[PDB]
């Protein structure tokens, strides 16, 4: 018993197509990675299944070929392969195998032999009438098991034989056969194959192996970034099936049509009509064994499957040999003169002997049959008229005798009679079908009720799937079902016992795979959304669902991978993924008091980045070329639909013009083009990182170059270039920066008025509530902080790609849409093929019209979806562009007092920079720092008069009282110059006695 | 439930209430200083005086009329609850969304 | 075709957008502030808020 | 077609809610985290808080 | 590769085909197509385009 781990082996090329540096997903028979593979070493029949993976490292070549015959004998066609040193000879011809088929050494294919530490990997498959053989021969290092690595199996040969291949046998050529070959069986699987630039498969991923593999298949990438990914759906399958029809009660009078003790005669056969009853044939089959039971219309079992409105029963007694006359198309006295079945009769003829009951020794002359009639009877007719038969050409004159005989003559039945004249009871059943409601059927069956389990149910003709529980609801007596607000069945009354059973849909929910980056680890956790942990490593139940593979930790961290209602997962470090309640932030209690204030004593100049999309890719679609290509028939058919193509073209043109308007609105704020002076000294402020670099031909700033480096045909689809090139947007950005540096905010509101940069920044400090002396006294420190922040901006942008995640997203979305729009060209949409020329060539025009119509409808719906999605995205981008224009006007051409609009902090000035399809704003902000606690008083009482500060707040260091501005601790002596009286001393609450000088 | 599922929001109602409590505490204890940087202690009457200066009214108006302003604010806050309760259409936007 | 994937992506984008909406509106404060235990704010009454 | 109609309508409603959420974020930053001089942005009258 | 006959791109469109007579690799580019735009001043001004 040798069994080995298959590893990642057995991946072949699905088709003849070449692909380069692409990842392709195929649904095809394959060997699942890490699977159950049998290592073999008298020789029973191995099942071929759908396919076989045969891996032989047999250097001795005891294995010469294979026997794929389904019988291994001369009964059927046996596929026989010989792989000698000369050549491979695939033979199919009829061979008389000897008693021991072994050599000392119709349909034939001779080729170069398959054989050459060789790993002979072979894949044998048989689909759509073709037998496919794939081969691979690779050197292996010293090992007695399958090597670790990846090898692709090139196709070797195809055979058009297409016969049934159930069993395969390894051909024996010598008896102890010890051969070291692995055999595995292929399965229908979905795989993802990575082709290199050389055209070969370097690696593969099996979708249904593990959750990480499923998410790799879903994203079509071998590297999965950190996040939570919705992969599949989870449904609980029905374990059992239940059928419930009402109590079989009432029943067809079958016990009366038989066991009647008298069948009258056959000249006037008793006609019995039966309808509206429960059909049960148990008594019919339980009666005496039948001499003749022939059914002409339906099988006896399937009689119960077929429902008949009208059932006709005809009962009579005839002799033994006259039974053969009661059959369709029979000629004979009884058949033509007593009871004639139709040629296309559909019914059962049941006959059983009645000699034991209806035979009398004296002679039972009651039963009679007719032996003289004027003509043959029409089918299904009863003639009871008995007058003197007129055989003679003379008138009978109502009497009998000469040439005038009685029409009827009786059987004389006596028990001593032999078989062939004994009385036989025949009951002919006739079934009629007519176009009206039926309501007559056979024993409707029923199964035991199953509760609290996902079951299929068919309750009184109502079908469904679900979990059946007891219901508190009380139905009215005549009701059967219960239906909720959405018109879905929620309760059912059981027919057999009147019980109200509630129906609950079986558990279903999404499956999400919480993974760190594939670089960080291969461990994953799985979240079943909305599923109780009972219904599905470490199992944890959360409001989102059931989380398997992550351990709950009491401590709280900042959220990393969102899951649900306050639960986030992270890879913190056996130790693995942990789930926790997310921490909103550090708790800080501000020391509030009646007379305590906190005044900052220093500042920080902080530069932040805000990335805003401005424009999206401009696309134009040629409706005729996309839908139809070069086919004239398709164009003629499209003309009937209307002017849809014109509407789509109008919408796309509108989007394109809107994109141009967006870029103009954001960047064309200034009409003049301003140039910075050649002598670039601005009071210690270094704008080199934002100003253009003359050295490189692009004339872009270092930050702009970094942004462009980071972010950075078909079928009627065209990408129209933007009206403004990147160089023109660079010129606009340079003009805005030069105007801001040289003229402050004056260039936005009129003519540019030059002002030294320190003076401009001092006026911005006045704008944020800080005096000029703060800037002029701390000019070098402010300059150094600004320089350090601008330096750090480059590193912050470069190191973290996610900072530019907005703009890139736009690009990706556009590409994705286009790819979908092209991919749906290959979709069939219910037609024969995606290729219009193939449909036109294979099918006649009248039949091809429907296929082309389906393709046109599908492709036109695809175009409409694309245009609507583009319109929604254009609305979003227009909103972003309007926000960017407002920020350019209010943050770059001016100083804004709006909080959090221009950066985080007290806004000083904003610098624009251009990025592919967007704008990056560098906001410079004043952040207070190093705060100190002081005692404060609303007013100072001097000379019985209150005193309030003109600007600032009254503060105390503990013994002395000063007046200082809010945002910077600059204590000043309280003087009448910085105070105003405004009232007496009694009214104000919290007033402090103190001295005010003059 | 025919394949339609409702995903829970990431932030629970308790967590949003906790953000709202943080915002209110910051506004009451620190004025607008907590938005632009570290939160700085300031007595609430001083904050209202600075807000009066912002709207163009001197500090003496607040300090001299502090009880009146406090009573007016308290009465308005008291009336807000009754006004919301009386007219359901006040919350008609959110309901409509749902 | 791949209509199911497009619809699923659209709904997922909507969901993430809703979470980001709530984050943007409410998560502006970096730290969680607590009001002092003694609630006297110069006669102002914040008990209802 | 029914599902695509639902997704498109829900995307439009998501755009409307996103506009409302951006307005709410702006109002939180400008009215709650500061004093706004913008007329009628934060209530009717001269905005205090 | 010796067994491969067609070539497909990332969009599942044919980009290379092997010549059945002689084994040579032939690249297929789509035949030139584009849109046509007419730049005109107002017909009230002039008729040149
Ligand atoms: C081996 O097979 C080839 C294939 O037809 C055949 O020509 C040759 O005669 C065979 N040789 C032996 C060993 O019989
Ligand atoms: C695959 O491509 C690489 C390209 O660098 C080349 O070095 C290598 O030889 C190729 N392998 C082949 C042709 O088998
Ligand atoms: C059907 O027969 C069962 C046998 O126990 C009985 O309990 C039930 O009441 C019957 N159905 C009706 C509708 O009476
Ligand atoms: C899961 O099932 C248990 C069984 O008692 C129940 O208590 C619990 O409430 C269920 N979970 C949910 C989310 O309803
Ligand atoms: C308070 O400030 C004065 C300056 O006016 C200084 O002389 C004194 O030492 C300081 N002491 C305290 C109480 O902090
Ligand atoms: C301030 O001076 C006045 C003058 O009489 C006095 O009545 C008052 O008590 C002083 N302030 C305090 C807080 O004692
Ligand atoms: C005012 O505050 C008191 C406690 O200080 C409280 O009981 C009362 O309800 C408040 N009134 C309001 C908010 O109208």
How many Å apart are CA A250 and CA D12, to the nearest integer?
A: 61
Chain A environment of C31 (Cβ under 8 Å) = 585-588
- Judging by beta carbons within 10 Å of its beta carbon (0-12, 13-18, 19+), is residue A950 exposed, middle or buried? exposed
Task: Specify whether the CB–CB gap between B37 and A900 falls below 8 A.
Answer: no
The finding on whether A87 has its CB within 6 A of some atom of ligand 1 is: yes
How many Å apart are CA A664 and CA A674, to the nearest integer?
A: 17
Q: Which residues face A159 on adjacent strands?
A: A131
Task: Specify whether the CB–CB gap between D33 and A900 falls below 8 A.
Answer: yes
Which member of C6, C30, C40 has the closest CB to residue A820? Answer: C6
**Going edge to edge, which strands form the sheet with A500-504?**
A240-244, A454-459, A462-470, A500-504, A489-493, A481-483
Query: Could you tell me if residue E29 is left (phi over 0), alpha (psi between -120 and 50 degrees) or otherwise beta?
Result: beta
Residue A314's CB is within 10 A of a number of other CB atoms, namely 23
Residue B61's CB is within 10 A of a number of other CB atoms, namely 14
Look-up: residue for tokens 């670099």?
A: A693
Residue A130's CB is within 10 A of a number of other CB atoms, namely 12
Copy the structure tokens of residue A154.
């090139």
Helices of type H across D1-49: 2-27
Closest ligand 5 atom, residue A957 Cα: 14
Ligand number with the minimum distance to the CA of A198: 2
Copy the structure tokens of residue C36.
């002092």
Task: Specify whether the CB–CB gap between A876 and A615 falls below 8 A.
Answer: no
Closest to A327 in 3D by CA, of A347, A310, A311, A307: A347
Closest ligand 5 atom, residue A958 Cα: 13
Task: Specify whether the CB–CB gap between D42 and D36 falls below 8 A.
Answer: yes
Cα A404 to chain centroid distance, Å, stands at 89
Which member of B23, B35, B48 has the closest CB to residue D34? Answer: B35
Helix (H, G, I), strand (E, B), or coil: what is residue A852?
Answer: helix
Cα torsion A291, A297, A300, A302 to 10°: value is: 180
How many Å apart are CA E24 and CA E22, to the nearest integer?
A: 6
Copy the structure tokens of residue A426.
């025949």
Which H or E run contains A743? helix A726-743
Distance from CA of B25 to the nearest CA of A (A): 9
Give buried/exposed letters for A417-429 (b at 16+ CB in 10 A, else e).
beeebbbbbbbbb
Helix (H, G, I), strand (E, B), or coil: what is residue E8?
Answer: strand
Closest to A247 in 3D by CA, of A611, A514, A494: A494
Closest to A856 in 3D by CA, of A519, A626, A606: A626
Closest to A619 in 3D by CA, of A713, A705, A721, A550: A721
Cα A69 to Cα A47, A95, A787, distances in angstroms: 11, 12, 83
Q: Touching check for D47 and chain B: CB below 8 Å?
A: yes
Provide DSSP, A471-533.
Answer: ------TT--EEE-TTS-EEEEE-SSS--EEEEEPPPEEEEEEEE--TTT-S--EEEEET--T
How many Å apart are CA A691 and CA A839, to the nearest integer?
A: 61
SS3 content of chain A, % helix, strand, coil (to 5): 20, 30, 50
Per DSSP, A748 falls in state T
How many Å apart are CA A532 and CA A542, to the nearest integer?
A: 9
3-state SS record for chain B: CCCCCCCCCCCCHHHHHHHHHHHHHHHHHHCCCCCCCCCCCCCHHHHHHHHHHHHCCCHHHHHHCHHHHHHHHHHHHHHHHHHHHHCHHHHHHHHHHC
Instruction: Give helix A632-639 / helix A845-887 axis angle, nearest 10°.
Output: 70
Cα torsion A958, A961, A964, A970 to 10°: value is: -70
Q: Which residues face A47 on adjacent strands?
A: A167
- Judging by beta carbons within 10 Å of its beta carbon (0-12, 13-18, 19+), is residue A318 exposed, middle or buried? buried
Considering only CA atoms, which residue is closest to atom 12 of ligand 4?
A532
Q: Touching check for A14 and chain E: CB below 8 Å?
A: no
Considering only CA atoms, which residue is closest to atom 14 of ligand 2?
A198
Q: Touching check for D37 and chain A: CB below 8 Å?
A: yes
How many Å apart are CA A252 and CA B10, to the nearest integer?
A: 66
Which phi and psi (to 5°) does residue A352 adopt?
-145, 150
- Judging by beta carbons within 10 Å of its beta carbon (0-12, 13-18, 19+), is residue A635 exposed, middle or buried? middle
Length of chain A, please? Answer: 998
Copy the structure tokens of residue A595.
């007379």
Give buried/exposed letters for A864-897 (b at 16+ CB in 10 A, else e).
ebbbbbbebbbbbbbebbebbbebbebbbbbbbb
Which H or E run contains A286? helix A282-286
How many Å apart are CA A954 and CA A28, to the nearest integer?
A: 82
Which phi and psi (to 5°) does residue A578 adopt?
-120, 145
Which H or E run contains A90? strand A88-91
Q: Which residues face A40 on adjacent strands?
A: A181
Query: What is the Å distance from ligand 1's center to A977 Cα?
Result: 120
Look-up: residue for tokens 């979708």?
A: A207
Task: Specify whether the CB–CB gap between B63 and A987 falls below 8 A.
Answer: yes
Copy the structure tokens of residue A706.
């970094």
How many Å apart are CA A403 and CA A393, to the nearest integer?
A: 8
Which phi and psi (to 5°) does residue C23 adopt?
-60, -45
Q: Please report how many Cα atoms fall inside a 13 Å half-sphere around the Cα of residue D10, on the Cβ side.
A: 18
Chain A environment of D29 (Cβ under 8 Å) = 898-901
The answer to whether the CB atoms of A901 and D29 lie below 8 A apart is: yes
Q: Touching check for B23 and chain D: CB below 8 Å?
A: yes
Per DSSP, A97 falls in state -
Per DSSP, A418 falls in state P
Closest to A89 in 3D by CA, of A109, A69, A62, A107: A109
Chain B environment of A927 (Cβ under 8 Å) = 36-37
Copy the structure tokens of residue C24.
């943007």
Which phi and psi (to 5°) does residue B57 adopt?
-120, 140
Query: What is the Å distance from ligand 7's center to A961 Cα?
Result: 35
SS3 content of chain E, % helix, strand, coil (to 5): 0, 20, 80
Considering only CA atoms, which residue is closest to atom 8 of ligand 3?
A497
Strands A577-581 and A551-552, bridge-based pairing: parallel
Chain D environment of C2 (Cβ under 8 Å) = none
- Given a contact as 3+ CB pairs under 8 Å, which chains touch C? A, B, D
Query: What is the Å distance from ligand 5's center to A973 Cα?
Result: 13
Q: Touching check for A472 and chain C: CB below 8 Å?
A: no
Cα C10 to chain centroid distance, Å, stands at 22
Q: Touching check for B56 and chain D: CB below 8 Å?
A: yes
How many Å apart are CA A428 and CA E47, to the nearest integer?
A: 96
Q: Which residues face A973 on adjacent strands?
A: A962
Q: Which residues face A608 on adjacent strands?
A: A923
The answer to whether the CB atoms of A879 and D19 lie below 8 A apart is: yes
Radius of gyration over every alpha carbon of chain E, rounded to an integer in angstroms: 22
The answer to whether the CB atoms of E3 and A826 lie below 8 A apart is: no
Copy the structure tokens of residue A923.
């906001």
A907 contact partners, CB below 8 Å, separation of at least 6: A768, A891, A895, A896, A897, A898, A901, A923, A924, A925, A926
Which phi and psi (to 5°) does residue A244 adopt?
-135, 110
Helices of type H across A76-210: none
Give buried/exposed letters for A680-693 (b at 16+ CB in 10 A, else e).
eebeebbbebbbbe
Which H or E run contains A261? none
Copy the structure tokens of residue A450.
């199953």
SS3 content of chain C, % helix, strand, coil (to 5): 50, 10, 40
Ligand number with the minimum distance to the CA of B82: 7
Cα torsion A374, A380, A382, A387 to 10°: value is: 0
Residue A320's CB is within 10 A of a number of other CB atoms, namely 19
The finding on whether A565 has its CB within 6 A of some atom of ligand 4 is: no
Q: Which residues face A251 on adjacent strands?
A: none
- Judging by beta carbons within 10 Å of its beta carbon (0-12, 13-18, 19+), is residue B81 exposed, middle or buried? exposed
Strands A408-410 and A404-405, bridge-based pairing: unpaired
Q: Touching check for A653 and chain C: CB below 8 Å?
A: no
Q: Touching check for A529 and chain B: CB below 8 Å?
A: yes
Look-up: residue for tokens 């050389």?
A: A198
Which H or E run contains A273? strand A270-274
Q: Touching check for B98 and chain C: CB below 8 Å?
A: no
Closest to A605 in 3D by CA, of A904, A397, A847, A219: A904
How many Å apart are CA A707 and CA A41, to the nearest integer?
A: 64
Degrees, nearest 5: CA angle A192-A194-A196: 165
Closest to A372 in 3D by CA, of A402, A337, A323: A337
How many Å apart are CA A922 and CA A907, to the nearest integer?
A: 11
Helix (H, G, I), strand (E, B), or coil: what is residue A760?
Answer: helix
Query: Could you tell me if residue A629 is left (phi over 0), alpha (psi between -120 and 50 degrees) or otherwise beta?
Result: left
Helix (H, G, I), strand (E, B), or coil: what is residue A878?
Answer: helix
How many Å apart are CA A780 and CA A763, to the nearest integer?
A: 17
Copy the structure tokens of residue A223.
């590297």
How many Å apart are CA A787 and CA A400, to the nearest integer?
A: 143
How many Å apart are CA A483 and CA A491, to the nearest integer?
A: 7
Task: Specify whether the CB–CB gap between A729 and A669 falls below 8 A.
Answer: no
Task: Specify whether the CB–CB gap between A239 and A249 falls below 8 A.
Answer: no
How many Å apart are CA A874 and CA A869, to the nearest integer?
A: 8
A179 contact partners, CB below 8 Å, separation of at least 6: A40, A41, A56, A58, A62, A63, A170
How many Å apart are CA A797 and CA A709, to the nearest integer?
A: 11
Look-up: residue for tokens 């011809």?
A: A93
Task: Specify whether the CB–CB gap between A551 and A540 falls below 8 A.
Answer: yes
Closest to A605 in 3D by CA, of A416, A755, A793: A793
Helix (H, G, I), strand (E, B), or coil: what is residue A772?
Answer: helix
Closest to A315 in 3D by CA, of A349, A342, A363: A349
Which H or E run contains A934? strand A918-936
The answer to whether the CB atoms of B18 and C34 lie below 8 A apart is: no
Closest to A603 in 3D by CA, of A779, A732, A735: A779
Per DSSP, A310 falls in state E
Which phi and psi (to 5°) does residue A113 adopt?
-60, 150
Give buried/exposed letters for A58-88 (b at 16+ CB in 10 A, else e).
eeeebbbbbbbbbebeeeebbbbbbbeeeeb
Closest to A410 in 3D by CA, of A369, A354, A373, A382: A369
How many Å apart are CA B32 and CA B16, to the nearest integer?
A: 20
Closest ligand 7 atom, residue B75 Cα: 14
Cα torsion A17, A22, A25, A30 to 10°: value is: 70
Which phi and psi (to 5°) does residue A995 adopt?
-110, 140
Residue A180's CB is within 10 A of a number of other CB atoms, namely 17
Which phi and psi (to 5°) does residue A759 adopt?
-65, -40
A697 contact partners, CB below 8 Å, separation of at least 6: none
Dihedral sign computed on CA atoms, order A900, A904, A909, A910: negative
How many Å apart are CA A686 and CA A690, to the nearest integer?
A: 9
The answer to whether the CB atoms of C18 and D22 lie below 8 A apart is: no
Distance from CA of A136 to the nearest CA of E (A): 13
The finding on whether A496 has its CB within 6 A of some atom of ligand 3 is: yes
Closest to A349 in 3D by CA, of A376, A331, A325: A325
Which member of C17, C24, C28 has the closest CB to residue D14? Answer: C17
Query: What is the Å distance from ligand 5's center to A961 Cα?
Result: 9
Which H or E run contains A775? helix A772-777
């Amino acid at each position: 018993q040798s069994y080995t781990n298959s590893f990642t082996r057995g991946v072949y090329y699905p088709d003849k197509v070449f692909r380069s540096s692409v990842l392709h997903s195929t649904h095809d028979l394959f060997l699942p990675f890490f699977s159950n593979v049998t290592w073999f070493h008298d020789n029973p029949a191995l099942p071929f299944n759908d396919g076989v993976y045969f891996a032989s490292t047999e250097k001795s070549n005891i294995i010469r070929g294979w026997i794929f015959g389904t019988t291994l004998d001369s009964k059927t066609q046996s596929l026989l392969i010989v792989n000698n040193a000369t050549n491979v000879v695939i033979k199919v011809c009829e061979f008389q195998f000897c008693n021991d088929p072994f050599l000392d050494v119709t349909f034939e294919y001779v080729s170069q032999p398959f054989l050459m530490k060789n790993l002979r990997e072979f894949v044998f498959k048989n689909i759509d009438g073709y037998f496919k053989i794939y081969s691979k021969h690779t050197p292996i290092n010293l090992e007695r098991d399958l090597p670790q690595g990846f090898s692709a199996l090139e196709p070797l040969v195809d055979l058009p034989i297409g016969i049934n291949i159930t069993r395969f046998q390894t051909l024996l050529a010598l008896t102890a056969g010890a051969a070291a070959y692995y055999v595995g069986y292929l399965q229908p699987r979905t795989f993802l194959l990575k082709y290199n630039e050389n055209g070969t498969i370097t690696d593969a991923v099996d979708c249904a192996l593990d959750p990480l593999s499923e998410t790799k298949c879903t994203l079509k990438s071998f590297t999965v970034e950190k996040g939570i990914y919705q992969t599949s759906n989870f449904r609980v399958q029905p374990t059992e099936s239940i059928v419930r029809f009402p109590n079989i009660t009432n029943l067809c009078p079958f016990h009366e049509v038989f066991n009647a003790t008298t069948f009258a005669s056959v000249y006037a056969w008793n006609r019995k009509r039966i309808s509206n009853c429960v059909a049960d044939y148990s008594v019919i089959y339980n009666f005496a064994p039948f001499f003749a039971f022939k059914c002409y219309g339906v099988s006896p079992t399937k009689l119960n499957d077929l429902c008949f409105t009208n059932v006709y029963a005809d009962s009579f007694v005839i002799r033994g040999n006259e039974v053969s006359q009661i059959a369709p198309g029979q000629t004979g006295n009884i058949a033509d003169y007593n009871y004639k079945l139709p040629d296309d009769f559909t019914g059962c003829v049941i006959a059983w002997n009645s000699n034991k009951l209806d035979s009398k020794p004296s002679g039972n002359y009651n039963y009679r049959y007719r032996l003289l009639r004027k003509s043959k009877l029409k089918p299904f007719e009863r003639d009871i008229s008995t007058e003197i038969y007129q055989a003679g050409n003379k008138p009978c004159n109502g009497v009998a005798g000469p040439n005038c005989y009685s029409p009827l003559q009786s059987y004389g039945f006596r028990p001593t009679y032999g078989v062939g004249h004994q009385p036989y009871r025949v009951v002919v059943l006739s079934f009629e079908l007519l176009h009206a409601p039926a309501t007559v059927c056979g024993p409707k069956k029923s199964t035991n009720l199953v509760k609290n389990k996902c079951v299929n149910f068919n309750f009184n003709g109502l079908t469904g799937t679900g979990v059946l529980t007891e219901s508190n609801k009380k139905f009215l007596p005549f009701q059967q079902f219960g239906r909720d607000i959405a018109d879905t069945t929620d309760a059912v009354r059981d027919p057999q016992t009147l019980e109200i059973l509630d129906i609950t849909p079986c558990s279903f929910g999404g499956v999400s795979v919480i993974t760190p980056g594939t670089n960080t680890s291969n461990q994953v956790a799985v979240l079943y959304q909305g599923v109780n942990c009972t219904e599905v490593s470490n199992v944890f139940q959360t409001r989102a669902g059931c989380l398997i593979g992550a351990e709950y930790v009491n401590n709280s961290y900042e959220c990393d991978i969102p899951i649900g209602a306050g639960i986030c997962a992270s890879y913190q470090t056996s130790q693995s993924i942990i789930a926790y309640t997310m921490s909103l932030g550090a708790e800080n209690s501000v020391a509030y008091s009646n007379n305590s204030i906190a005044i900052p004593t220093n500042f920080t100049i902080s530069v932040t980045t805000e990335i805003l999309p401005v424009s999206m890719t401009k696309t134009s679609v040629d409706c005729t070329m996309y839908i139809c290509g070069d086919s004239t028939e398709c164009s003629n058919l499209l003309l009937q639909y209307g002017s849809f193509c014109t509407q789509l073209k109008r919408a796309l043109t509108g989007i394109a013009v809107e994109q141009d308007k967006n870029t103009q609105e954001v960047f064309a704020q200034v009409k003049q083009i301003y140039k910075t002076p050649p002598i670039k000294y601005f009071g210690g402020f270094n704008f080199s990182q934002i100003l253009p670099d003359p050295s490189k031909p692009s004339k872009r700033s270092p930050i702009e170059d970094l942004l462009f480096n980071k972010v950075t045909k078909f079928n009627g689809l065209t990408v129209l270039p933007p009206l403004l090139t990147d160089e023109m947007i660079a010129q606009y950005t340079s003009a805005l920066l030069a105007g801001t540096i040289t003229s402050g905010w004056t260039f936005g509101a009129g003519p540019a008025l030059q002002i030294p940069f320190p003076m401009q920044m001092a006026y911005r400090f006045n704008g944020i509530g800080v005096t000029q002396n703060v800037l002029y006294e701390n000019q070098k420190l402010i300059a150094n902080q600004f320089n350090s922040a601008i330096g750090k901006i480059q590193d912050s942008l470069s190191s973290t790609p996610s900072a530019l995640g907005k703009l890139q997203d736009v690009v990706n979305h556009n590409a994705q849409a286009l790819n979908t729009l092209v991919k749906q060209l290959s979709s069939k949409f219910g037609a024969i093929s995606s290729v219009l020329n193939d449909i036109l060539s294979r099918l006649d025009p009248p039949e091809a019209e429907v296929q082309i119509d389906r393709l046109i409808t599908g492709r036109l719906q695809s175009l409409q979806t694309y245009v609507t999605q583009q319109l929604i995205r254009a609305a979003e981008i227009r909103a972003s562009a309007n926000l960017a224009a407002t920020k350019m006007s209010e943050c770059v051409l001016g100083q804004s007092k709006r909080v959090d609009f221009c950066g985080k902090g007290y806004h000083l000035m904003s610098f624009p920079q251009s990025a592919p399809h967007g704008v990056v704003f560098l906001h410079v902000t004043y952040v207070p720092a190093q705060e100190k606690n002081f005692t404060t008083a609303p007013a100072i009482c001097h000379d019985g008069k209150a005193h309030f500060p003109r600007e600032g707040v009254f503060v105390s260091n503990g013994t002395h009282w000063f007046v200082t501005q809010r945002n910077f601790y600059e204590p000043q002596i309280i003087t009448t110059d910085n105070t105003f009286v405004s009232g007496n001393c009694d009214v104000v609450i919290g007033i402090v006695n103190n001295t005010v000088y003059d």
